[PDB]
Amino acid sequence: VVGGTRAAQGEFPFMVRLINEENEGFCGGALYAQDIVLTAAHCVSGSGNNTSITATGGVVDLQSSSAVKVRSTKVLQAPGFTKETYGKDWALIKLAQPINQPTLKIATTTAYNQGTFTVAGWGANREGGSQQRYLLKANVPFVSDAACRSSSSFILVANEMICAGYDTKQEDTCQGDSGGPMFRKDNADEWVQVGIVSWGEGCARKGKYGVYTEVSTFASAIASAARTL
Numbered sequence: 001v002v003g004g005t006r007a008a009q010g011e012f013p014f015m016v017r018l019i020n021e022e023n024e025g026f027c028g029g030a031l032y033a034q035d036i037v038l039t040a041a042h043c044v045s046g047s048g049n050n051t052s053i054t055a056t057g058g059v060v061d062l063q064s065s066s067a068v069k070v071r072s073t074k075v076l077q078a079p080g081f082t083k084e085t086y087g088k089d090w091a092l093i094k095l096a097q098p099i100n101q102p103t104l105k106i107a108t109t110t111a112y113n114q115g116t117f118t119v120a121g122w123g124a125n126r127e128g129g130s131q132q133r134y135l136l137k138a139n140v141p142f143v144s145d146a147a148c149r150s151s152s153s154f155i156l157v158a159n160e161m162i163c164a165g166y167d168t169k170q171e172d173t174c175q176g177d178s179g180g181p182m183f184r185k186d187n188a189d190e191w192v193q194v195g196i197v198s199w200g201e202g203c204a205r206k207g208k209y210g211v212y213t214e215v216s217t218f219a220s221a222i223a224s225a226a227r228t229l
């Protein structure tokens, strides 16, 4: 997370750090349920059963004695996600144990798709940099479809993707943050999830933004997939 500060311990406790000893991969995630994690489609390989992935939770410090490590049991990747565009970039992961921490509610409408979103993960703070040890937090403004459209050299898919961050300011999610939730407060003072960190042109680039899977568009399709897991 480029130019972020430190998450206080327990601040966003629905946070997960994901490591896929199968595809050799490091993502973020959120506890949709206490044993189901919401994350990026591209952070995983296929759908089906998978004993391979290790979600760590409860700590903001990836090392503390206290983390809870739990192995995946089965993985559900959005059918129709295309690696070719990171389009429809969402996936669920079931856990073997459940994690007793507080979970993150998801937007089931678009009501909350404006203004300032909070983002977090353990990804790199410099583009090209190492993964972190302590969970970092940062703020990023909503960027319109239009504004984002123009600025991007890859193609941006209307309701599936939503944009956020700054023109020039050194504050953006970065390599290793994928799968972490983009979220913000709702009218009833609760965090709601609007994004999954998906991709961007580099990290915090001049004239470049951050792209996020638009939870609201898939919330339906998601809600329905957990219930089979």
Ligand code: NA
Pocket (backbone or CB within 6 Å): 165, 166, 167, 168, 169, 170, 171, 172, 204, 205, 206, 207, 208, 209
């Ligand atoms: Na920027």
